[PDB]
């Protein structure tokens, strides 16, 4: 079951071959070409038209580049979004494989990735066919993609309480919740706390230990509640201030209680 491709080398490239014959100068891994299973790996003006066994014959023509843009080492920031360009096409139908498995067949020179997870690392293969004065080969290039970790450039965002004021009926208990969103830090040391503003002083209220309500590659959300057993008349004379801080900065949100 013959297939053709060509491989243009430039600066730091690699190449792979799949057993495209229906799976569940070689057959003899004599040179520096590595086989794992069903997939051979080429570390670079030769050839290497092999076959493996319903047999699959590959007919490769390695041919150095001459005229020449995203390169074969591309980084994806995990948590966030990203995209992997097809080095070749710096559009026809490009077929993407991630470590041998099929990803997309879209007519563009870039696959986009919405939520970069740990498994988005690997070697990606972007195939697209090419016909000339009649001859139909396939162009294969291999791009190695790394899921690199990167600290945020962002202050914590307070999502609750968003309102300046809270109406309360005194003699009844009240719980003010502070939720804030923290972006990734490799040494993550978040600060979230409640403060009181009476006459001109501020002091940290004395309870309780925060907890997470969300922990995903992009967001860590930490909530920390203040509880008053019964809102007294003084509790309208002070302000309660949520304060969050991470290694980029700090944000606060104050809450003034009303009566009704």
């Amino acid at each position, epitope marked *: 079951k013959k297939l053709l491709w060509t491989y243009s080398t430039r600066s730091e490239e690699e190449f792979v071959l799949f057993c495209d014959l229906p799976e569940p100068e070689d057959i003899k891994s004599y040179p520096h070409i590595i086989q794992d299973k069903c*997939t051979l790996h080429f570390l670079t003006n030769n050839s290497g038209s092999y076959i493996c066994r319903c047999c699959v014959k590959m007919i490769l023509e390695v041919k150095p580049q001459t005229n020449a843009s995203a390169s074969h080492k591309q980084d994806l920031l995990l948590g966030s979004t990203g995209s992997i360009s097809c080095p070749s096409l710096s559009s026809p139908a490009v077929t993407w494989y991630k470590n041998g498995k099929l990803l997309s067949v879209e007519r563009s020179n870039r696959i986009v990735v919405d939520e970069v997870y740990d498994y988005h*690392q690997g070697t990606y293969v972007c195939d697209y066919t090419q016909s000339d004065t009649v001859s139909s080969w396939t162009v294969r290039a291999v791009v*190695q993609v790394r899921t*690199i*970790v990167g600290d945020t450039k962002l202050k914590p965002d307070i999502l609750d309480p968003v309102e300046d004021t809270l109406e309360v009926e005194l003699g009844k208990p009240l719980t003010i919740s502070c939720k804030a969103r923290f972006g990734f830090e490799r040494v993550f040391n*978040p600060v979230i706390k409640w403060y009181i503003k009476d006459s001109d002083l501020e002091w940290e209220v004395s309870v309780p230990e925060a907890k997470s309500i969300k922990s995903t590659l992009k967001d*860590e959300i930490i909530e920390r509640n203040i509880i008053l057993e019964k809102v007294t008349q003084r509790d309208l004379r002070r302000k309660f201030v949520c304060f969050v801080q991470n290694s980029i900065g700090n944000t606060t949100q104050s809450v003034q209680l009303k009566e009704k």
Partner: single-chain antibody
Amino acid sequence: LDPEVQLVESGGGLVQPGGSLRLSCAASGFNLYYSSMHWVRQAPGKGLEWVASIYSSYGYTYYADSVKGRFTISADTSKNTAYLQMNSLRAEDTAVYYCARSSFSHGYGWYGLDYWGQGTLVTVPSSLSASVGDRVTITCRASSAVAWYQQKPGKAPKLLIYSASSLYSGVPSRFSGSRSGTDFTLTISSLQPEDFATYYCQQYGYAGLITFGQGTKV
């Protein structure tokens, strides 16, 4: 330039077999609720072996079976201190005990042991050989995101690579990492005089069991 991470170890000593001994790790620079703290061991001459993990946030603790039953790992988040409580040393426990941090926050993926202590001594790798300028490739066959460490004869391991490809901060661009099915491989492009060391690979998991490599002297 923000206040950064130390790891002090203590409590080691010469103990009789069947006895007990408490080791201590004074963490400095990181919050124990967003970090996993680990005891990794090195019996004199041999390679690195995982001993115990603690995840203070959830209160989870994990042990390598070769120990499981004897040692208790705990942490006091009011002092940022993790202790390894050793009971009934079976005299193979003789080794230097490192504690090392990892980032255990956000989605909880594994980006390596970033920081190690000097290790505290308690008493009860293969070879490559090439030269300055060569390309060297080291393979490792066996779900995790692998990491690569570089130990120099008497110091604690350094992180080179995390998430199997990504290159740790400070680590020169010479190095490379690959997954390739079940056989991960570290590369040094053009070996330099400083790159000679013992090299270890590592896996994580299933749940949380850390597996190190056998070692490679380059």
